[PDB]
């Protein structure tokens, strides 16, 4: 199809405080390095985490990092904290239409 | 690959250009990390870059003097050592004035090596001066493009000091190793061979100087405003990356083409045609680029193709007009125009755009290109040959 | 200094009708920045709805193109989203976000507002 589709394999991911987690984003088409990562806390609108698939903003903690290119992207949360648990989406802005990921919710293991 | 073949020395000059291109075209990557250790972004790192660009106006003339007198070997060694000692430690300095001093040292070395490569190309190809100058200028334009992602990775992982150190060492060592090899075909002053001071008396020099300065001035704002205008239109990010790559590739590749074109027809006619097309394209750029991604990329390609050719048209013109023997000093005096243009180009493009509109900004760039076109078409051809006044023993 | 985005105009409206969402902006001019409307499905799925650029050029995805119209008021710094021919799929919460700076590289949605809810169903 003409529209690009970003698929996050993990609909649900369970982790513990202090560990390392990685949310993966697989694109149907090559989007280079024009990919962003957003974090949506349950009661608030999404907050921008990663732009250009490798760069975080000022005020974004050093725990979150981004890597990848082409069709494979990864958002790595090292030393996960309690507040880190929220929903993470990947968005490509390489070409129109702009598309979003399915969404990965991070919760503690039951 | 023997010594004495002209193309071997042309390849060596292109290699020197590719080795010194890192100082100018890698600066965007180092600007933010170097700033992070220091104070204000716009002040510290950008003034360091501006000083490194301005110092070339005095660096290249003296290096050209020493090249015309004592050959290119020792001056190229000195320029390579200067690039080494300046660019290597820019990541290990803790004070802003030290950064200024080291960046000026590196920029002066780069200016010297650029002048040396251009003079070697012009001397070894007197019949194809335009083509050799274009190849060397393209090598200076396209030098760092292959290794830009690699140096970005080095900056991301191993740090700023390590990246500066690696790049400075590689550049200095390679330039110095090339310095051992290059040589000139053979001083004999002739009637048409002008001294730098004697050149500074002719009106033709100043007409060409104003044309080159206007071209560089308009080009600074053209590069500064082209891609951000595409972002202001709302084009996709991939389209903007393609546009950046097209800008770089065409600004590089147009130089040997325009050099050959000037060889086939002439310096002044080629300058007039190229600058007129560039002025028209820059005047029509805001309107035509709105038509979409394809129009934006086509306008970028055509505009940069018509803008980049000056760096090949002017060296061959200088060698043809003001003599080959003293040509190295004279082309440094011509390089002073590009050095001077960098004084204002810091935030001038963005200022003009955000203040008076994108259309008026590109109209000003087109007016600069049209000044160059008018000088090339109506002013300079009517003067004829330089007169060589006030000669001294 | 701080960037503020206030969404308003959300409601409970019958399908096939009109609505107008307003986004009050503060701290930046609409000229040198781009603005976008993005809605989130009640199943927490995000769909980019509209994006108006620095110059005023508008982009819509084919799913919601033609029905919706994104515009702006530079004099009062308000981003307007006119909605018409409302469908059952249009039930979502809309947010207005500012895009990249004209001379800067960034994502199309740098800062987000609170968000306003638009529901078009049998209720």
Numbering used by the authors:
A (entry chain C): 1 to 110
B (entry chain A): 11 to 196, 204 to 410
C (entry chain B): 1 to 123
Text of the article:
Oxalate transporter (OxlT), an oxalate:formate antiporter (OFA)10 in O. formigenes, is a key molecule for oxalate metabolism in this bacterium. OxlT belongs to the major facilitator superfamily (MFS), the large transporter family whose members transport a wide array of chemicals. Here, we present crystal structures of oxalate-bound and ligand-free OxlT in two distinct conformations, occluded and outward-facing states.
At the empty binding site, the Lys355 side chain flips out from Arg272 due to charge repulsion and shifts the positions from those found in the oxalate-bound form. In the ligand-free form, most of the interdomain hydrogen bonds observed in the oxalate-bound state are retained. However, the one between Lys355 in the C-terminal domain and Gln34 in the N-terminal domain is likely disrupted in the ligand-free state, judging by the distance between the side chains (>~4 Å). Positional shifts of the surrounding aromatic residues, such as Tyr35, Tyr150, Trp324 and Tyr328, were also observed. These changes at the substrate-binding site due to the absence of oxalate likely underlie the structural rearrangement of the overall architecture and result in the conformational change between the occluded and outward-facing state. Notably, the cavity opening to the periplasm displayed an extensive positively charged surface. The charge repulsion caused by Arg272 and Lys355 at the empty ligand-binding site as well as the extensive basic surface of the cavity likely prevents closure of the pocket to the occluded form in the absence of oxalate, thus stabilising an open state. The stability of an open state conformation in the absence of a substrate, which prevents transition to the occluded state, underlies the OxlT function as an antiporter, in which the conformational switch in the absence of a substrate during the catalytic process is disallowed.
